[PDB]
């Protein structure tokens, strides 16, 4: 299927290593790649009212644009004290082209970024407000707890 | 608004040659020359940016208050309308589109020329330098002259539009008055009481026209204890303070050409 | 009739395009209409038009024979035209088809890198493809 | 709903390209790193794409221009005109309508010789060492230059041969 084109383009976004960025890649993959997302998001769940406000859950928003690009859900959900909360995953779709050996942690992070940073939404719980960290304790345990930017 | 238009056309009608009582329409028209005062018209200004204001729409009832401030150009009382206006012009850079702020801006030339507030006329003028690049290159040099001749205080060249009254009015003006972008870092701050920090500031004009490379100021700063491109020579510390002090200049009121940008341009530290 | 198209990010009007069914506006309506469109953003938004589903808001705003909609996307980017009369003939589901259109070529622009969001639509290729719009609704 | 799953390669690309660009301002760099780069991605690919296909190998120029424009059909999805045929048959043109890195990225990149297709370079390069075509290429056409429609040039020229085993 169409998934060998960005692994391979993947592995070369890491490949290039300068000396000078810990980021490979910048937000902007993450802008432009959700915003084709949010083509794909013509029709979403939530009220029409004007006069009220309906929140879209990021979690669920993450969950089916991972179908849509990562291709398994959340294994764990958590939702922190804070407004923020943290997402656990068993397993990493690009992390099972890897065995479970902690080698090199940090390309893994350099992947997952590309839900990081993301345009955000005025309401809490509104569908793309993301200001996130990835902390991987384990190599397809694939751990990421937000932050809110605000506050 | 439209009502004191059509008076104004109804003078131009007048300015024609002016039986079926005609002349008592044209009274009529007298009767209607007296509602010409138009200041009814800012009372309802007032009314509707009160009344806006009720939900606490600001930039609805702002947007009335330009209005209410051309509408005094337009009667020609610039004192009220530079008021308003004063108030509106840090909003409208804090809306950061220049556009409608650079029209407003030379509005405000306008209104402080007659009224001759020519410490806010500058001020609005070296922020409209500032990024002034959707004007005329031309009338930015003439503004630059005006800028170097109300420093020294002479009168500014916009006499094409000043008249003798006003100018004399703002000739009163500076006596009392008391006082683009560049970038500031710094190479090491919070030393070992050994240091010896640099000019780290880098001095940039974004205005296409130069502005006379005159002169340096810097300020010393107390915390803990007392103590295109152009750079020149400064050597701003040499001075081998005391530790663990930040000295951030609040603004940098270096000499270039004139005093300074002083409409609050100024960045922290590194 | 004229319509004025305009995408809106946070407070600028990134790109705003004064068009006819003829030609461009001719009339000195340019700095007017502009502050129309930033004073109706700005008080709608302060009002709850910031919400999630892409926001659908025909006639929220009525000039001079020019009445005007605003649409939302959860990425906080609003879309402006107006129809020059109290009344014409024309729909709104046609609005809603144009405007769709218009987030089509609104992310096939942000596609290029080169534009950083938060700047005017500089391409004269996307500018007249937005102007195929504007032929396609006048 | 959702069928096209890609149109996130034109923009990963673009920062790509972009960030290329950021590093290193001169236009050519961001060719031929990118090209190279290309290179290795089109060693990864060609080996999937013979795992699919069980093509015997590209002994012959047509053939080998049918199992590009398969690569392509598979993948990248866009149809290869084979057009352009030299009296020597060693060349051929391929004729894209629709750019398939990109959908849309924008007609000026502000600036010429930003090679748009290095990795296309590499897409059509690597496959060939790879299936030991020692084979240079190079673009006659770029619509995105300006141009109406998007012609490669491929010339093959020493049969990769393995040696000393």
């Not at chain 2, 004191?4 to 020359?33: F, G, H, I, K, P």
């Not at chain 2, 959707?134 to 930015?140: F, P, T, V």
């Not at chain 3, 946070?10 to 004073?39: C, F, G, I, R």
Request: with cysteine; glycine share 4%.
């Amino acid at each position: 299927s169409e998934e060998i084109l960005f692994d391979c383009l993947h592995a070369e976004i890491v490949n290039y290593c300068l000396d000078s960025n810990k980021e490979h890649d910048l937000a902007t993959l993450e802008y432009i790649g959700f915003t084709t997302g949010y083509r794909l998001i013509e029709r979403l769940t939530r009220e029409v009212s004007r006069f009220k406000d309906e929140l879209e859950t990021m979690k669920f928003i993450c969950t089916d644009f991972w179908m849509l690009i990562y291709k398994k859900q959340v294994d764990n959900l958590r939702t922190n004290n804070h407004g923020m909360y943290v997402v656990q995953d068993k397993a990493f779709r690009f992390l099972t082209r890897i065995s479970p050996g902690t080698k090199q942690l940090e390309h893994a992070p350099k992947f997952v970024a590309f839900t990081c940073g993301l345009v955000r939404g005025a309401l809490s719980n509104l569908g793309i407000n993301s200001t996130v960290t990835a902390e991987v304790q384990s190599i397809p345990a694939c751990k990421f707890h937000i932050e809110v930017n605000r506050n | 608004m439209k009502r004191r238009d059509a008076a104004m056309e109804a003078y131009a009608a007048m300015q024609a040659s002016s039986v079926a009582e005609q002349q008592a329409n044209m009274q009529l028209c007298d009767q209607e020359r007296s509602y010409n005062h138009s200041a009814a018209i800012i009372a309802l200004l007032s009314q509707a940016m009160a009344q806006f204001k009720i939900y606490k729409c600001l930039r609805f009832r702002k947007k009335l208050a330009i209005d209410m401030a051309e509408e005094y150009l337009k009667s020609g009382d610039h004192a009220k309308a530079l008021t308003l206006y004063s108030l509106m012009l840090p909003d409208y850079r804090q809306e950061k589109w220049t556009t409608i702020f650079t029209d407003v801006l030379l509005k405000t030339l306008r209104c402080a020329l007659l009224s001759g507030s020519v410490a806010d006329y500058i001020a609005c003028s070296v922020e409209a330098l500032s990024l002034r690049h959707q004007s005329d290159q031309s009338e930015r040099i003439l503004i630059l002259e005006n800028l170097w001749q109300v420093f020294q205080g002479v009168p500014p060249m916009p006499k094409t539009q000043l008249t003798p009254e006003a100018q004399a009015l703002w000739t009163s003006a500076l006596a009392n008055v008391k006082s683009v972008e560049m970038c500031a870092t710094f190479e090491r701050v919070q030393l070992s009481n050994d240091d010896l920090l640099q000019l780290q500031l880098i001095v940039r004009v974004l205005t296409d026209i130069p502005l006379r490379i005159r002169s340096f100021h810097v300020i010393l700063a107390d915390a803990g204890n007392p103590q295109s491109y152009y750079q020149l020579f400064c050597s701003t510390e040499a001075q081998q303070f005391h530790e663990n002090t930040q000295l951030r200049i609040v603004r940098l009121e270096a000499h270039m050409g004139t005093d300074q940008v002083a409409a609050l341009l100024t960045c922290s530290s590194n | 009739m004229a319509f004025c198209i305009a995408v809106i990010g946070k407070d600028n009007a990134p790109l705003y395009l004064t068009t006819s069914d003829m030609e461009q506006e001719l009339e000195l309506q340019y700095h007017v209409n502009a502050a129309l469109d930033v004073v109706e953003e700005k008080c709608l938004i302060g009002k709850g038009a910031p919400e999630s589903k892409e926001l659908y808001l025909g006639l929220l705003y009525s000039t001079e024979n020019h009445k005007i909609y605003g649409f939302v996307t959860n990425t906080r980017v609003k879309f402006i035209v107006v129809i020059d009369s109290s009344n014409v003939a024309l729909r709104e589901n046609e609005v809603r088809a144009i405007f769709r259109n218009l987030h089509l070529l609104y992310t096939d622009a942000i596609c290029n890198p080169f534009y950083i969001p938060g700047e005017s639509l500089t391409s004269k290729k996307f500018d007249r493809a937005v102007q195929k719009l504007m032929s396609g609704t006048a | 709903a959702k069928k096209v799953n890609s149109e996130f390669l034109t923009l990963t690309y673009g920062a790509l390209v972009t960030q290329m660009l950021r590093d290193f301002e001169n236009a050519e760099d961001v060719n031929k790193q990118l090209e190279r780069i290309g290179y290795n991605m089109g060693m990864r690919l060609i080996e999937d794409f013979l795992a699919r296909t069980s093509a015997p190998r590209c002994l012959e120029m047509r053939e080998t221009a049918d199992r590009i424009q398969q690569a392509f059909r598979i993948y990248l999805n866009i149809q290869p005109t084979i057009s352009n045929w030299s009296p020597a048959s060693d060349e051929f043109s391929l004729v894209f309508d629709s750019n398939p890195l990109t959908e849309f990225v924008e007609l000026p990149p502000d600036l010429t010789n930003l090679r748009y297709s290095a990795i296309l370079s590499g897409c059509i390069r690597g496959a060939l060492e790879m299936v030991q075509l020692e084979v240079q290429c190079w673009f006659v056409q770029d619509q995105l230059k300006g141009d109406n429609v998007t012609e490669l040039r491929v010339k093959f020229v020493r049969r990769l041969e393995e040696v000393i085993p």
